[PDB]
Amino acid sequence: ERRYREASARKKIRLDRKYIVSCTEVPLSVPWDPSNQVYLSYNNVSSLKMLVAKDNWVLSSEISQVRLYTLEDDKFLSFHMEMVVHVDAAQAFLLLSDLRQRPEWDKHYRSVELVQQVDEDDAIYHVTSPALGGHTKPQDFVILASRRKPCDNGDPYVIALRSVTLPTHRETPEYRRGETLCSGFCLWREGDQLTKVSYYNQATPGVLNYVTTNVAGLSSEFYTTFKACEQFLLDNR
Numbered sequence: 325e326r327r328y329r330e331a332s333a334r335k336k337i338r339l340d341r342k343y344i345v346s347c348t349e350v351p352l353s354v355p356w357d358p359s360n361q362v363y364l365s366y367n368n369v370s371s372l373k374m375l376v377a378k379d380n381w382v383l384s385s386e387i388s389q390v391r392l393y394t395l396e397d398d399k400f401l402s403f404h405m406e407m408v409v410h411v412d413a414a415q416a417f418l419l420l421s422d423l424r425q426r427p428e429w430d431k432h433y434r435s436v437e438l439v440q441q442v443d444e445d446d447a448i449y450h451v452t453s454p455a456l457g458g459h460t461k462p463q464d465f466v467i468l469a470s471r472r473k474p475c476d477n478g479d480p481y482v483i484a485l486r487s488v489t490l491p492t493h494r495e496t497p498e499y500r501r502g503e504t505l506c507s508g509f510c511l512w513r514e515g516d517q518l519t520k521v522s523y524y525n526q527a528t529p530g531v532l533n534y535v536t537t538n539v540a541g542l543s544s545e546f547y548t549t550f551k552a553c554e555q556f557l558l559d560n561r
Contacts, residue, residue: 328541336540339401343536346529347399352503353487356448356468365446365470368484371506375402375526376480384539387547394539400505400527403539405550406520411557413511413519417481419560420509420521420553421471423449429556430549434462439493445471450493453502456534463500463530466493474513480522481511502530521557523550 378395385392391406427433437450451465470484485507495501505527512520537543
């Protein structure tokens with residue numbers, strides 16, 4: 325309603341003012357080296373856990389028991405979605421770990437190609453996303469997906485996502501080369517057939533405007549795309 329439209333747009337303008345200066349000070353994509361595969365996979369998963377462990381997360385919104393947290397770092401904007409689903413965490417882990425089945429429920433992943441299967445729990449994908457507001461071209465990503473099972477009780481299943489570079493899939497004029505610093509899921513066992521599904525996205529300069537629109541409340545594509553995940557997991561029990 326009017327009362328919310330006006331105050332929301334004010335919040336969006338402030339966030340743009342703060343993050344107009346995008347961010348090399350931090351490295352988005354990293355060279356892929358089969359020799360450093362174990363550390364690229366370790367640093368990938370380690371980064372996501374440290375993001376979860378940060379303390380200055382602030383709640384922005386809640387809709388039908390689906391929360392939305394945000395974190396205003398000095399250089400980049402991070403958000404995080406929380407949700408509880410009625411599926412076993414182990415089952416949700418196998419579904420959310422294969423990005424090839426992610427276009428089936430996420431509007432933001434148009435196509436997904438598997439470039440190289442490093443090992444059991446690590447792989448390199450080639451992702452393409454539709455053109456967001458203000459572009460004629462879709463943008464593509466070269467992402468390393470690393471998954472790890474929880475070590476102890478209470479620790480989460482982790483699926484990590486980081487952009488990398490490969491000499492075989494270099495930037496092409498048909499797509500815009502996007503780059504995400506660190507994203508992925510975190511799944512907790514909240515009980516028998518219960519799972520707290522969490523999506524984290526640390527930084528993606530190629531979609532800043534898109535994010536600040538959802539955080540301010542002027543849009544609801546995060547919630548739509550995230551409840552589609554809830555519906556994607558429930559059907560595979």
